[PDB]
From a paper:
The primary experimental system utilised is a 101-residue homo-dimeric protein, CcdB (Controller of Cell Death protein B), which is a part of the toxin-antitoxin (CcdB-CcdA) module involved in the maintenance of F-plasmid in Escherichia coli. To understand the structural basis of stabilization, crystal structures of three CcdB suppressor mutants, namely, S12G, V46L and S60E, were solved. The structures of the S12G, V46L and S60E mutants of CcdB were solved to resolutions of 1.63 Å, 1.35 Å and 1.93 Å respectively. On similar lines, in this study, the crystal structures of CcdB mutants reveal that the suppressors S12G, V46L and S60E possess novel hydrogen-bonds with water molecules or adjacent residues, that were absent in the wild type protein and are likely responsible for stabilisation of the native state of the protein by these suppressors.
The structures of S12G, V46L and S60E consist of a single chain in the asymmetric unit, with two chloride ions. Subsequently, another putative global suppressor S12G was identified by analyzing saturation suppressor libraries using FACS coupled to deep sequencing. S12, located beside R10 and E11 on the exposed loop, is involved in hydrogen bonding with the cognate antitoxin CcdA. The suppressor S12G alone is 0.8 kcal/mol more stable than the WT, and the double mutants are apparently 2.5–5.0 kcal/mol more stable than the inactive mutants. The suppressors E11R and S12G refold at faster rates compared to the WT. S12G shows a much slower rate of unfolding. A cluster of water molecules at a hydrogen bonding distance from G12 stabilizes the loop and anchors it via interactions with the backbone atoms of neighbouring residues reducing the average B-factor in this region. These two water molecules substitute for the hydroxyl group of both the conformers of serine in the WT structure. The CcdB positions 10, 12 and 46 are involved in CcdA binding and mutations at these positions as well as the nearby E11 residue will affect CcdA interaction and conformation of the CcdA interacting loop from residues 8 to 15 (8YKRESRYR15).
Author numbering:
A (entry chain A), B (entry chain A): 1 to 100
């Protein structure tokens, strides 16, 4: 569901993603997602406009906007958070990536 | 470069992609891309708004908008075409995917 945050069931670079596909856009068996990376190590100067900072599980995370990818529904795990309250910064970051 | 079409150097689901990242958005070593699939078999009723039909190498191709992904520059092959003349339908398809 748009702006809900889930765990990957499968091993990869990242452990969380935010679903960014519209809820009225039907892709049977897949969703378009932006992975989240722990900010803990991630460099502070990195653009917050292109890479928003979000708060999940009492820690800071970077939205890895430029690692956006489709995930099959088979690998979508537990829903862990909702980022709909960050819709503005998510929209701004995606629109910057394509249209600057 | 935004809206240029390239071959993948590596085997995968698709053989071509269109670069859709802004030219003023710097992701060292990667670009955001939408793969192209031969329309030849692809079903005619499929939304042309979400999945535009483009013409390359004297054949029709479907822009697989919902398979958008980052590709490392190491796997970017020859530039084969330019789709900047389809910027309007590409923009419309991406904006529909996220914002309907
Ligand atoms: Cl991480
Ligand atoms: Cl937040
Ligand atoms: Cl194909
Ligand atoms: Cl065309």
């Amino acid at each position: 569901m748009q702006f809900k945050v889930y765990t990957y069931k499968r091993e990869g670079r990242y452990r969380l993603f935010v679903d960014v596909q519209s809820d009225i856009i039907d892709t049977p068996g897949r969703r378009m997602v932006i992975p989240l990376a722990s900010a803990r190590l991630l460099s502070d100067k990195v653009s917050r406009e292109l890479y928003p900072v979000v708060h999940i599980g009492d820690e800071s995370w970077r939205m890895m906007t430029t690692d956006m990818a489709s995930v099959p529904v088979s690998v979508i795990g537990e829903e862990v958070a909702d980022l709909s309250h960050r819709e503005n910064d998510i929209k701004n970051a995606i629109n910057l990536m394509f249209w600057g």
